[PDB]
Ligand binder design. Structure first.
Ligand SMILES: Nc1ncnc2c1ncn2[C@@H]1O[C@H](COP(=O)(O)OP(=O)(O)O)[C@@H](O)[C@H]1O
Ligand SMILES: [Mg+2]
Ligand SMILES: [Mg+2]
Length: 395
């Protein structure tokens, strides 16, 4: 192919509990190597893994955390940002057990912002820095959640817990029908949409559920100007569910993800993309048209050994997957062209069942992606002010 899926392993520092209760540290880092030591030093031998990148921290001090997040972004964030500005599809997904540091890496906290806020900030910084009257940038965003093979729109002002149907089109592929793609023009729009989205996650029986997947997506459309050309880069930041074992199809997407990774590691006929919602929607990110990075977060202490190992192993396979990313030039024109063509052919065959409203679907897709930019702005605005009025009757 062209490029291999790049793999980084992030080892979170020993927390207060692990130090107080004298839980033994079994994971240590040697440059780009991850060494997993046995728990009771018969096959108690140190296991050594090698990856593209390895992050670690000496303690939980604010200095080391700031340095940590900075390191992670400098190593992975700016690269995929550059990919976005080069018209490439790019993706970063966090894999690991609950409490290893997936969300802390992807989203981070208020004092320790993760990959996503830095990515958005840097994105709008660069766009605002480069935009001429010959160069223009259009930025869209979406945030979805996948729980129990059901998709929810996290950017919907009304967290109605209503599932959105996942449908397939012949020329478009897998898509979430009804998902919000909101036009944004600054970091704060994204910030409010994200703060609202992050408090709309699926609750557990007790504390957000660790069984849900979170997919954040940025679309960057660059136009160069007596005619104009266009490139589109799509970033996909994914915070997966906890990889640990069970303590129906609640773990379908995770297991299927494992199977997909394993299959690719060894025309997608026997790669089970379709066996789950997650692998189906993120099919192009794994062995497809995308620059893909995996961040495997692991816990350092012995009490998580078998999990850590597992994670490591999966990571070790992920670096064998080969993607083939290309620059997406004027994809919208091609898509609407193929869509209208298909509409006409469906119109012709219709004059001779499953084609009755397939054309309806195609026309719907056409009309929805021919929506003017201004109306998208107005949409995002009314959504925003409805969020501003939903806290009015609640105050
Ligand atoms: N690399 C890290 N460095 C410092 N603290 C971390 C790190 N990763 C996780 N943590 C700490 O442990 C907490 C749990 O992390 P979290 O992102 O919720 O894990 P997960 O999403 O996989 O369940 C975090 O709030 C953070 O304080
Ligand atoms: Mg989390
Ligand atoms: Mg999108």
């Amino acid at each position: 192919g062209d490029s291999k899926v790049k793999v980084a392993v992030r080892v979170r520092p020993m927390n207060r509990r692990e130090i107080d209760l004298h839980t033994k540290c079994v994971v240590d880092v040697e440059a780009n190597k991850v060494i997993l030591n046995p728990i009771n030093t018969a096959r108690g031998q140190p296991k050594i893994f090698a990856y593209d990148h390895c992050f670690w921290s000496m303690d939980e001090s604010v200095r080391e955390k700031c340095a940590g997040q900075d390191d992670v972004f400098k190593c992975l964030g700016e690269n995929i940002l550059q990919n976005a500005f080069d018209g490439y599809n790019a993706c970063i997904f966090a894999y690991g057990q609950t409490g290893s540091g997936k969300s802390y890496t992807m989203m981070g906290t208020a004092d320790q912002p993760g990959l996503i806020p830095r990515l958005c900030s840097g994105l709008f910084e660069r766009t605002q820095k480069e935009e001429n009257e010959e160069q223009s940038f259009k930025v869209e965003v979406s945030y979805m959640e996948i729980y129990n093979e059901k998709v929810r729109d996290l950017l919907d002002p009304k967290g109605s817990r209503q599932t959105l149907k996942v449908r397939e089109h012949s020329v478009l592929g897998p898509y979430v029908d009804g998902l919000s793609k909101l036009a944004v023009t600054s970091y704060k729009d994204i910030e409010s949409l994200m703060s609202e989205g992050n408090k709309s996650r699926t609750v557990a029986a007790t504390e957000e559920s660790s069984r849900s997947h979170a997919v954040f997506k940025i679309t960057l459309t660059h136009t160069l100007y007596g005619t104009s050309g266009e490139k589109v880069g799509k970033l996909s930041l994914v915070d997966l569910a906890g990889s640990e074992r069970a303590t129906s199809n609640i773990n379908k997407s995770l297991t299927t993800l494992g199977l997909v990774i394993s299959a690719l590691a060894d025309k997608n006929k026997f790669v089970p993309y379709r066996d789950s919602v997650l692998t189906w929607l993120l099919k192009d990110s794994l062995g497809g048209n995308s620059k893909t990075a995996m961040v495997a977060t692991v816990s350092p202490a012995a009490d998580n050994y078998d999990e850590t190992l597992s994670t490591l192993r999966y990571a070790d396979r992920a670096k064998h997957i080969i993607n083939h990313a290309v620059v997406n030039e004027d994809p919208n024109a091609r898509i609407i062209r193929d869509l209208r063509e298909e509409v006409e052919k469906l119109r012709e065959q219709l004059t001779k069942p499953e084609l009755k409203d397939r054309l309806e679907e195609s026309e719907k897709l056409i009309q929805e992606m021919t929506v003017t930019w201004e109306e998208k702005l107005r949409k995002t605005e009314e959504i925003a002010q409805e969020r501003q009025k939903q806290l009015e009757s609640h105050h």
